Design a binder for these strands. Sequence first.
RNA 1: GUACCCGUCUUGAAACACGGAUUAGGGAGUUUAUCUGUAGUGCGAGUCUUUGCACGUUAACUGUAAAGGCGUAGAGAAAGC
RNA 2: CUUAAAUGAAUUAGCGUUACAAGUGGGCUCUGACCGGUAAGCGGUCAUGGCGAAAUGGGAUGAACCAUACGUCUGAAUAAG
RNA 3: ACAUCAGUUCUAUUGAACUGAGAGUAGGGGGAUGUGGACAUUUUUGUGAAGGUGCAAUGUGAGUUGGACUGGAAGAAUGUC
Lengths: 52, 50, 60, 48, 149, 123, 185, 50
Amino acid sequence: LQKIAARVEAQKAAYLKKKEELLAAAKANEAKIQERAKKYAAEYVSQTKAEI
Amino acid sequence: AKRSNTSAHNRSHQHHRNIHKCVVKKLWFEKGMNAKFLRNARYAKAGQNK
Amino acid sequence: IEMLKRVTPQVAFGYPSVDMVRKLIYKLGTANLNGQRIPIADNQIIKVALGHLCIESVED
Amino acid sequence: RFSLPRSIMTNADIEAVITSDAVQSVLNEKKEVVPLPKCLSVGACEDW
Amino acid sequence: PTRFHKSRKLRGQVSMGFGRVGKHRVSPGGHGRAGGQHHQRTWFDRFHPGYFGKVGMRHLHLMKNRADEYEPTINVDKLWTLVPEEVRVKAAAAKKGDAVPVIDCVQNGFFKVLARGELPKIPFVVRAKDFSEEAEKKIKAAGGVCEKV
Amino acid sequence: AEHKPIIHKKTNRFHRPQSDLWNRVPSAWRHPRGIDSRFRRKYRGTPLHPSAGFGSDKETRFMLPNGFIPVIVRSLKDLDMLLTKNTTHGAMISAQVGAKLQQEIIKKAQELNIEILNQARKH
Amino acid sequence: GVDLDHRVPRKQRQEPKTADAQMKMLHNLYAFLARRTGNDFNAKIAHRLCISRTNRRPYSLSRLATALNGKEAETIAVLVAKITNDERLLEVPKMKVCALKFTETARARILAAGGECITFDQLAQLRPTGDKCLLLEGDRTRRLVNKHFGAAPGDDNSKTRPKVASHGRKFEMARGRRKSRWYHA
Amino acid sequence: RQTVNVLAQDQKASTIELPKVFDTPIRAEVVKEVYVNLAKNAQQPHANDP
RNA sequence: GUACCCGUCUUGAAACACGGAUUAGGGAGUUUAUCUGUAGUGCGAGUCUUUGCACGUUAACUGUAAAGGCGUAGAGAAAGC
RNA sequence: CUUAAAUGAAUUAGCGUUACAAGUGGGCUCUGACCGGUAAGCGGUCAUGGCGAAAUGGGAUGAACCAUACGUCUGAAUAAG
RNA sequence: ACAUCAGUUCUAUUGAACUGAGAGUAGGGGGAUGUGGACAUUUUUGUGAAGGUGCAAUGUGAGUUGGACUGGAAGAAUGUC
């Protein structure tokens, strides 16, 4: 119980390490989805302009 | 007295509730096959392990 | 198509445009994950399932 | 004919065995279930 | 007992788990082994084949204390089970000399001996009524004697 | 305590079919096994069958109009059961218990604050 | 209205049908491990404790000597069964074993040759991973009832043994069993 | 091995160690199955007029 | 607004099919022997202690000697193996 | 033993195996195909469906036809009609 | 929105969150109610037991419980049998 109460202190820190990391990873993804949505928009309109 | 002789109405239904594919254990069937072939196939195996 | 020829009396079908394929998936779209019929909610649902196949978010 | 009956366990209870650090080091971390939201997800739909 | 029966739960159910159209009744087939060559033949043919007919030679006044019927068997792999385990440990440490222990099968109710498995290389003496060919062969090869009675 | 508004889903008791007609037939429910029975079949103008559809909420089950779930109290010794769960369950003193021990159970309850649901015994 | 097949073909036993303390207890120990450690060894030990007494076949001590011949020391033979001693095996090896119960003959033999006599809750401290363990099981079809199972006798050739009280001539050896009396199966 | 005292006739006279029967595990199911069947032995057979 | 009289054999009963005037109380898958298979329990190459004897706060419970049952070796009509 | 190169239709899906046992062994029928018959709500077969054991709505009324196969409720928009 | 029965994600100590499904005769499985008697354990009763008649709750339901009148001596609960 003294070892387990010690060990959960590491699991507090190792949780909050991944909390900082995955939020930072999310912001990198929130850049890269925006170029794809803009790509597929201008790719759709050029498909219509091609055939017409 | 005179009742029905047969029917096949819902033979199909029962068969399909479960047409299970009965699989063969091995392709050789040593009860059959040539004895002269299988006789030699023993002496291939017996000579090898020595 | 030859499967759809057998079942033609049971179904209505056609060729949807991109504005319709969009509007289904944003409104009514759901992910069948581990046989659970989960609602689509957020893009972190479909990153976990489909990210290895290079499909990150609902636009992809 | 009788001889004196054995137990299956050596101990009385389990809880000493699980809580020991021999076991606990090997275990994975204790998970817990997220409840899921009910709701505009995407950052820019207005390009479309 | 009477609580746990399926009959107890089938109150209200009118047939008590026995059908409407057939009606559960005392003599469907006929009594016991009846119609074994006729209308219950399928049961006999399918589950107990060879039931009908006569085979063999009639034996009159069979007794089973005769030494014609009565032969209990024992196997070469054991025998050493008949003696307690302090004996053969002393018999292992011995010269080619003396004091070779007599495993009496006939006292313990075993007349014939039959070689299905191994022995060690301890010397011993089997007193029995009969042997097999291979049982006599194995006891020699261990280094021991085959007495008859 | 705090809880939902209690709502029952059926108001009245279920009758057995044809029980209104006959005095031999008691009005306690019995599932009809007749082969030609209209009731087993569910036609219109038959009562609905008692079934897991009609089950009340898991919070509000066995709950009185007051608030409290009635535990039966047969003696002073049995009143220790309600000491833990004070404002979820509540007492209900038995009809066997006479007028002298009635007053003692009320006096014990007013000390420990357990609301007694039995009412107006009289005298 | 949905088209599904609602029936269950396969039940599986989840928790044990014994009303012991101890079998139910050390089921929950290895159920707890099998989830949490996420390992194939402990998942099997968890499930073996569920299963009925017929399938937990008694793994005899001569089979235990054959398995461990080769395997080096500090190697437990874990075994969700009873161990029963062989008469016919003569000198036992020195061997480390874990099982639910031993017979009192077998425990004497293993201890007298410097062995070990380990319980499952003892083993959960020692080897949670099951590193240098060895799972063993008795064969399912060694039961006598199991020889009656199969194609019905008389199918040519069932080899299934008909259900009979008394053996010899006279009892089920004629019309069916031999080709002299009409037909052979 | 652990001990329990022995009361003097009045008081404690001495301390005696437990015998090895007190080791054996307590079984509610096994004591039920025995006692239930064993109590049927302590009874008298009765029957209605045949 | 809706709603045919229940029980029953039947492919089909509201039937111009049969039973049913009312009410109370009785009123129908039980037990034995020889087995089968599944699950529980104890011991395990063993296992069962009962016919019986010795105990007893006495039909119980408790203790125990030796046989015997089934299992441990089978195939063959049988000799022999 | 090994020298090469890959998981080489669509859509879908966990698959395999054993034991014990109930009821049943009178069926009827829409739409097509068919044998016998002047024909039958007639007799005898075939394929999928239905009733029997399937409510509710529709065909005024109907076991079988059409829509649809059902926990208890509160709405919306429909199917047959 | 609510109930039930499955399942999926997790959870020691009996639970959590979420998803899906809905006819049923012959028949099978799971959990529960009630009755006569038994062995423990715990009580109630001439300040009125059981029973009976009406009424109000409560449970999906088999049921169970309260209070009023009548009655004048025994009843009931919990766990196993």
